[PDB]
Design a protein around this ligand. Structure first.
Ligand code: MN
Ligand code: MN
Ligand code: MN
Lengths: 314, 314, 314
């Protein structure tokens, strides 16, 4: 299948500006060029242009509900279009709120997909439980069937249709969960591997586990929503919500490497890369480079090396 | 049981001043306020005032024997009082020599306790084996029954009564043991997991192993003596004897997290935090924050998150 | 068996000068003195003097073929002399091209040896596959029987006799392999554990694996060829080709400690320590100390501690 890059330069999902420069930063680092050197046909769709909704009064505590809901509906339509044509979508964030459009779109064409959410957070706060307005912390609430109607309808999200059930999502790398979120994942019986489970089992046993939970009964396409903060701030410092005690660069690459091997990766997001949040330029390069490394790993790049078949060396 | 904070700002246990500022620094980071947010009643006893013994001539190579012995006698009495009232004592060091008073006190009330010593060192040098006078490196020698009389009586420690035998202590994180100490732990048959076993088994199997060694025959109260240098200098740099190749922040929190789950934590020490040894202020903050995080983990804080029961979110 | 230190201050194996100062740096750090404190007799043979071959025109893309070929022949002779006398040779590089002489020499006296190559790279490019002239990235191509005649005869290497077959070498720590090298290791069926396998199995299971592969059928002397870049750049930054995502200091010491326990260590190389490549002096000290620590570990130094037997402490 070919790969289609889609930039989502949107940052109204959280309080600080910056994530909109994520797509630019990743491209400037040669992400598309590097991708072209793999056994995949790469088409770069370019960055979506989001029309800013005027007089976007907060719902209640929820902020920018219309701009976010609109931007997502727009993104969902695009993602649905490429998936339709049989291509693998890669969304360059942009903050996590944009995972609503990405997974929705993807689900329109692939209704039986599962989601592997790699993050330091669950991002499952409903507009009620949220302690801030911020929508980047609420993606999964708007996507879960089991949470349908457990909160008021938000302006701009009328189009949203809960596509995944609690049995289709696995979390990896949790270490910063709110009481409400914790209550929800505990109540609904959601599967997760927080840093304490990664510490106990090892990333090898962790991936083995997630694949038999998700793919044990039957094979289905996978959507990997990757948040750069799921790794330790020492590796990906330039994000808005860094939390020490994260996954290591190695563990990061092991996750993506294992995913490639299933041959089921259908959708992928690289979110939260905030170019303006690094103390020094080296921190921006460090974050960007690991974000790219993660991407190429999903598409065949192995640490043991790679070589073009049919070519005879020697 | 309630929790009682007891500050032991003592530094005569070793050659450099500074560890006396450990309690002040931990407090300033909000250690007590944060503890209060847990499902525990927190009472802060304050910092003990130690009277300096005049003309404290070295025993032999042993330094400040009277000031260290006196200070511990004082601390042992306090710890015994609180343990007697059914509370959990938390001693904020201060150097390791103060572990003599802490464990003694705890043992007068709970004679069947076991000790889990997390440190890069065994701190088991007798006044004979020591290559320096420093008592901070001799705590366990004064507490072991099997070492009673294998060395001369030291001034200021007449009150000491060997409370634990070689089968009641487990070491975790060893990577800097002296020949003599190595001789002792090898001879006496002491159980330990140096960095090489942590590397071979993994922290999960390590904790699993210590719990069945210590609690396999019968449950008994646990005294966790935690030396901040048991973790890698990259995480807790502000100590006097850092040794590269340590336990990681995650490994540290996994230790504390497992301990909480036994529900047997009865005594806890957070030793060696020397605010004056960080090259830059960030190093002090880093050491202090991880010391605090370890403390809260012991009292319930989980990485997967926590939530107040009886409260309904949604 | 005694130990014989042999310095190979050579750097024509790669484009940058610097590795010739490796032996100097290692010695200045007290490597020989520290070695003398082990249960081994240490003789320091000193540094080899290499005569520079005039008018050393590039073979094809291959650079300095004569200087490197000669230097190795000289080193092979010395190594064979000490091996003959029943000693364990320790070669202090110097770049990896000097592994050609080291292993060859050792193989003349011990034709049944196996090689454990710890490195970020396979260093198996033939003069054809190389994308640069650099011989430091070609050692193994000149030593494998299975690659004999798969490339033109290079000037200065006529004396070389392929000594090890594809079943006698195991790689550990791979994370930067070229397409050709990857083609070769995949084709010839060479056993390896790249970073991804280390991540999956853990270093304990990895060493257990290499020992049964290599020593399962019958015991034979081991040649440990250790390249300082097999550890992460955070521990050994002063090398020419650093690659993030490496083995940790702990993982490093576990390798060496396991090798000592076999009692089969017959030859050892400590290569690539480039004193002139550290940003700050602390980076040089860091690289050098871990190289030293690795060496002592091979010769008995344990993390749990060591003590002289027959001596009674207490
Ligand atoms: Mn996140
Ligand atoms: Mn210590
Ligand atoms: Mn290398």
């Amino acid at each position: 299948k070919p790969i289609e890059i889609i930039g989502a330069p949107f940052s109204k999902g959280q309080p600080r500006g910056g994530v909109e420069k994520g797509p630019a930063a990743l491209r400037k680092a040669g992400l598309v060029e590097k991708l072209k050197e793999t056994e995949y046909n790469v088409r770069d769709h370019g960055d979506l242009a989001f029309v800013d909704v005027p007089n976007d009064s907060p719902f209640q505590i929820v902020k920018n509900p219309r701009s976010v809901g609109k931007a997502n509906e727009q993104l969902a339509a695009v993602v649905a279009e490429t998936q339709k044509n049989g291509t693998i979508s890669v969304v360059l964030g942009g903050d996590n709120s944009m995972a609503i459009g990405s997974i929705s779109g993807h689900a329109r064409v692939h209704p039986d997909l599962c989601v592997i959410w790699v993050d330091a957070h669950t991002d499952i706060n409903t507009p009620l439980t949220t302690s801030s307005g911020n929508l980047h912390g609420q993606p999964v609430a708007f996507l879960l069937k089991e949470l349908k109607g457990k909160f008021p309808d938000v302006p701009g999200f009328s189009w949203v249709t809960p596509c995944i059930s609690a049995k289709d999502i696995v979390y990896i790398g949790l270490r910063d969960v709110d009481p409400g979120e914790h209550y929800i994942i505990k109540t609904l019986g959601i599967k997760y591997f927080s840093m304490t489970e990664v510490d106990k089992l090892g990333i090898g046993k962790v991936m083995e586990e997630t694949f038999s939970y998700l793919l044990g009964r039957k094979k289905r396409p996978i959507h990997l929503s990757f948040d750069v903060d799921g790794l330790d701030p020492v590796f990906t410092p330039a994000t808005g919500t860094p939390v020490v005690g994260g996954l290591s660069y190695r563990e990061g690459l092991y996750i993506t490497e294992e995913i490639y091997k299933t041959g089921l990766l259908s959708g992928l997001d690289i979110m939260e890369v905030n170019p303006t949040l690094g103390k020094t330029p080296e921190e921006v390069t460090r974050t960007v480079n690991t974000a790219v490394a993660l991407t190429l790993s999903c598409f065949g790049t192995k640490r043991e090396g790679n070589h073009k078949p049919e070519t005879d060396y020697l």
